[PDB]
Ligand binder design. Sequence first.
Ligand SMILES: *[C@@H]1O[C@H](CO)[C@@H](O[C@@H]2O[C@H](CO)[C@@H](O)[C@H](O)[C@H]2NC(C)=O)[C@H](O)[C@H]1NC(C)=O
Lengths: 48, 48, 425, 144
Amino acid sequence: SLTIGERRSLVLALQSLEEDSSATGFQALASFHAVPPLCPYPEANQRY
Amino acid sequence: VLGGEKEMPWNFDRLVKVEITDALNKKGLKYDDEYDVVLSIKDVSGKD
Amino acid sequence: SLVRKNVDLLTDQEVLSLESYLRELEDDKTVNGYQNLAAFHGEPSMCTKDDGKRVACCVHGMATFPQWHRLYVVQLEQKLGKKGLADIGVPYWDWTKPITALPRLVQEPIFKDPKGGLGQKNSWFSGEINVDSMDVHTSTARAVDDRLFQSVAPGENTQLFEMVLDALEEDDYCHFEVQFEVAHNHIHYLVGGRHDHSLSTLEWSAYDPLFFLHHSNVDRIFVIWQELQKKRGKTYDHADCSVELFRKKLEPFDRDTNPIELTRTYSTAKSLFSYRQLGYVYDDLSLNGLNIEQLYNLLEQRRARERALASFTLHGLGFSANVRIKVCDHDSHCEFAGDIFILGGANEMPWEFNLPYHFDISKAVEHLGKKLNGDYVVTAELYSVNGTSLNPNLLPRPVGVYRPAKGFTDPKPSESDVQSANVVI
Amino acid sequence: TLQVEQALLKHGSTVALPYWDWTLPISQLPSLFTEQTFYDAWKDEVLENPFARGYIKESKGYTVRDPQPELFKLSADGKHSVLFDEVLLVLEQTDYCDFEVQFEVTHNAIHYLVGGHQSYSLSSLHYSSYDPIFFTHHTFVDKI
Ligand SMILES: *[C@@H]1O[C@H](CO)[C@@H](O[C@@H]2O[C@H](CO)[C@@H](O)[C@H](O)[C@H]2NC(C)=O)[C@H](O)[C@H]1NC(C)=O
């Protein structure tokens, strides 16, 4: 149930995120779920 | 040195002394002369 | 000789002269290359292992650490002078005064032209490693740690200052080695930081000129220790320990491949105990406003103070590491105690110490509230270069020691009259 | 000034270029520019702040900033710079052409205040567009 205006808005926003390379980048944000492991915290010698 | 398999790890803090004056003088060599110290270790089992 | 000053008191024209000379030495390599001079200290080292293991030529943990590094710094200053500069030697950066930031000479990343125009690279900010065999052709970095600028309340001073004060206080060369290496091993880690190619490691630590900015002050405090010991009246010109190590000749300055002739003249370790003949003189011999007499009195009065100390034994690791020391009550009320730094590298001789290390823990025990001669426990936590921890059983456990006030005596043992009848002879 | 925002957005911007209000008292340059290099460890490589220097593809040099003592002067109340009064003067009049003639030198001022005496800086317009503080200042100009 989408229309041209907001559909364009969403696709452009996501394509803007995709080519970003900042701290709040798409890659950086999506890296939380999986590799690299950052949890429970990197200080521990066990990483998963 | 008295050692066995079931020894909890141990390491000293400062060197242990052994007298050498009574042999260096008897050979005539002053302490600064070119001389070597050779030690050979033999376990109770009989392996060097 | 060449008179020596501290960086914070120099003026502009000499800074321009020395920077011009440094640039014209670092651009060209030939055999007179700054990269080669750094490789003399570190990777790629040339003094292979006596077993042919291709180990570093850098002396660390032995008796000849200060002498070898003093020879290194005088070699570089003579190298710079031979290029045509005959005003000032490599200046010394003082950190005993409460520091807040880096010195001006190492601040700007790319130097400006004094007149105005085309800019020029700032070597004192950083250098570049361009080894082709290891395919590393990248500039170095200064991953500064923020915790180097602890401006604390007066009366007491920076932990670096107190610890180096105790180091210079101690009154024997063999013990001075151990009490000195820890102090030298602080800034290296705290400046090298997270980046691999930096001062924290040992393979390419000396490429940044902060190496020399540090070892200059190292030699300075070494000389002040020598003069203080001479005034207090004990033999120093010859060392009663590590005589075989002293008899060993230094490397690789012995070989004729070194263009500088002063190293060939003074290759022996014995002669370096005198610094005058090397050719440089420090302008001032006062420590942050305190001269020989004041520091002598302070040290003598501090040698009658009750203390609690932590004793350590250590060896090589192969990679630099922090050790956070922690003091706890017995079994929990356990509070932070202090820090220690150790330096390790991929190519480095297995080194062990000839004396346990002494560290100050009295303030932490006082914070815990127990009496100095009371009871407590000490534990250690090991962190690698990259922040992460590691299995803390590699190093031997620390020990606690109580140092009494001078003049104290033990309680008298009992004498007894007939020993009753319970005793058996 | 607007033209750069399209490039920034298409190359991964997050917000537009902020405007710096220099009418407020200025202890020193903003810390964002004053900073030199920070470490994030995401790439395990220190990053130098691109708000200090600029590369030139024909001269192989770089710009150089220079503070000036007069820039730190403060007004009688101490809550405004000396430029506040002339900014009000520019604002107060009516005609558009008079506005422009009274207004040009105002933004020209900071170019000389922060450009120093360097041929490669904001002092000369020939290379002033190679330092992002120029973008920030002209953004504030459009705001005026
Ligand atoms: C920090 O660097 C050390 C370098 O040794 C890393 O330790 C190695 O970690 C890998 C797995 O990540 C192990 O397979 C090796 O055995 C470890 N080496 C040693 C000598 O123990 C450590 O993982 C690094 N940590 C972080 C957070 O980067």
